[PDB]
Structures are given as C-alpha cells and as structure tokens.
Amino acid sequence: NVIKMKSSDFLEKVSLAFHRTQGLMIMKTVYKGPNCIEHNEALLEEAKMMNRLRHSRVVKLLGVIIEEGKYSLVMEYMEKGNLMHVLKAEMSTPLSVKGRIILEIIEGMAYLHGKGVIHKDLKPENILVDNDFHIKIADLGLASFKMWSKLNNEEHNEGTLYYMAPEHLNDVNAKPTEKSDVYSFAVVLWAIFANKEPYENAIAEQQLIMAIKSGNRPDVDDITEYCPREIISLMKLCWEANPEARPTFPGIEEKFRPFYLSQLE
Ligand SMILES: COc1cc2c(cn1)N(C)C(=O)[C@@H](NC(=O)c1nc3n(n1)[C@H](c1ccccc1)CC3)CC2
C-alpha cells in the first residue's frame, strides 16, 4: 500500500532519504512551483496503480509526497545500485549468480507482461540489485508513470538507444510491444557477460541508429569471459530484427529455467 507521506516524515533531483520511522529510502522530487492541485487525485491513483504491480522482482514504490507545490516519489533502497554498477565492480560476479539474475529478470518481465505492462525502457539502469544479488525491475525514467512524467516535464517546474528495438530507432510513430522489451532483454543478456555497454566503437548517434537498423548487433566476439553457447543463442534469438519472431518471456522462461538449474546453479 502507498502512503501519502510528508516532507516532515524525513530528516532535513534524486537523493537518499531517511524516513523518521521506517528508514532508508530513495526520493525523487518530481516538481516544484505553482500549485497545480487539480492534478492531485490523478497523481495519487497513478501511484496507486504502479504500486499495485507487486512481485518479488519488481521494485516497490513506498510512498508519494503531494504538497502545495512539491511532488515526490519514494522508492525502496536497493543497496548494490543498478546492474551495470554490479557488472563493473572490482569483485567479479560468478556464472551462477549471472544465471540467476537472468532468470529473475525473466520472471519480473513475465509478471509485468502478464499484467499488460509493456516496460518500453528495459536496460541495466532499470535493473536494481540488493545486497544478496537479487534483482528488481524499476521504471526510473517514468515510462509507465504517465501523469508523473508529464508533471516532470511541465514548463513552470523548477536516453540511451543501445537497448531500443530497431523498430523504434528513427520512428517515434511505432507503438512499443512486448517484443520491444524482449529485444532490450537480448542486449541486457550481452551486457551481463561483456561486463560493459555495447557499441563502444560507435562514433555518431546517426551512425549507430542506421547501423542497428541495418542489422548490426552487440559484438559477440567482444565477450572475453566464458558465456554458455545456449545463452549466446538466446540473445541472438531475442534480438532478431523481425519482432514477431522474437519469443515471449514465458517462452524464454521455459527454455532458460531448466538450463539454469541443470548447468549454472
Ligand atoms: C534515479 O532516478 C530515479 C527515478 C525515480 C526514483 C528514483 N530514482 N524514485 C524515487 C522512484 O520512485 C522511481 N520509481 C520507479 O522506478 C518504480 N516504482 C515502481 N516501479 N518502478 C515498478 C514498475 C516497474 C516497471 C514498470 C512499471 C512499474 C512498480 C512500482 C521513479 C522515479
């Protein structure tokens, strides 16, 4: 359940926050300025609906702060940051854990798709990791928070394409689908084993967009550490140019869970 929390609930732009009674949380204040009270109940219900997406692999929206001219969202604190932070830490992550993170991403995405939620911005920054290396899927760019996103863009307030299905590059009139997210997943799979972002040799945005739409993909030979052949096959399957040929997350799960259990766990 969501709390209509108050600024007063916290000790004296994104920022750490210590709730006076509940503890560490993440706050994004989305808006400062004129009153716009007419938006209040829609902002609250939208937060309620996002808060109703509950699953072990989906991040919890803990509270909102709705005040005279200050609107803030409050999220649970994931101790190890996002997945790229984890992949780029000095201490390595063993193959078993990488396999589990993949399985858990599949579960969160199957759950979301089960509820009719198309993420549209899946990427390592939206995959958060707790102290025990379990993951939760987040929506930090507010791609599913329609009203808060508009609130964030209002005039009187005070981006990466690596993971975008090629159908959406240079085409803002295509509607994203579940297969859009599957493509993103494919590139996340590559990042997990490369321990870095793809396309490091790309020079210009227009060169990248045109290259990916012509069929360029992340360089599989650039994976130095060991990567199971089945996982190389999965990412190639998941980033096929034809969206209708990419599998669903339930189809992915039925393949990868028995492979995870028998080979990587
Ligand atoms: C650093 O930038 C950000 C951006 C934000 C935040 C922290 N750092 N805070 C404080 C949040 O609360 C974020 N919330 C989410 O991303 C969020 N909340 C939920 N989800 N994501 C879940 C979800 C996941 C995927 C799709 C839809 C909903 C349901 C609850 C959105 C705004």
Residue numbers in the entry: 8 to 19, 30 to 175, 188 to 294
Describing publication, verbatim:
To investigate the potential therapeutic benefit of inhibiting RIP1, we developed GNE684 or (S)-N-((S)-7-methoxy-1-methyl-2-oxo-2,3,4,5-tetrahydro-1H-pyrido[3,4-b]azepin-3-yl)-5-phenyl-6,7-dihydro-5H-pyrrolo[1,2-b]triazole-2-carboxamide with cross-species potency against RIP1, exquisite kinase selectivity, and favorable pharmacological properties. A co-crystal structure showed that GNE684 binds to the same hydrophobic pocket within the kinase domain of RIP1 that is bound by necrostatins. GNE684 binds to an inactive conformation of RIP1, similar to type II kinase inhibitors, with the Asp156 and Leu157 of the DLG motif (commonly DFG in other kinases) in the “out” conformation and the αC helix swung away from the ATP-binding cleft, and lacking the canonical ion pair between the catalytic lysine (Lys45) and αC glutamate (Glu63). GNE684 inhibited human RIP1 potently in vitro, and mouse and rat RIP1 with slightly less potency. Accordingly, it inhibited TNF-induced necroptosis in human HT-29, mouse L929, or rat H9c2 cells. Consistent with observations in cells expressing kinase-dead RIP1 mutant D138N, GNE684 did not affect RIP1 protein abundance or TNF-induced activation of NF-κB or MAPK (JNK) signaling, even at elevated concentrations (20 and 200 μM). However, interspecies differences in RIP1 mean that inhibitors blocking human RIP1 can be over a hundred-fold weaker against murine RIP1.
Although the kinase activity of RIP1 is dispensable for NF-κB and MAPK signaling by TNFR1, it is essential for interactions between RIP1 and RIP3 that activate RIP3 to phosphorylate MLKL. The kinase activity of RIP1 has been implicated in many pathologies characterized by inflammation and tissue damage. The kinase domain of RIP1 has unique structural features, which allow the development of selective RIP1 inhibitors.
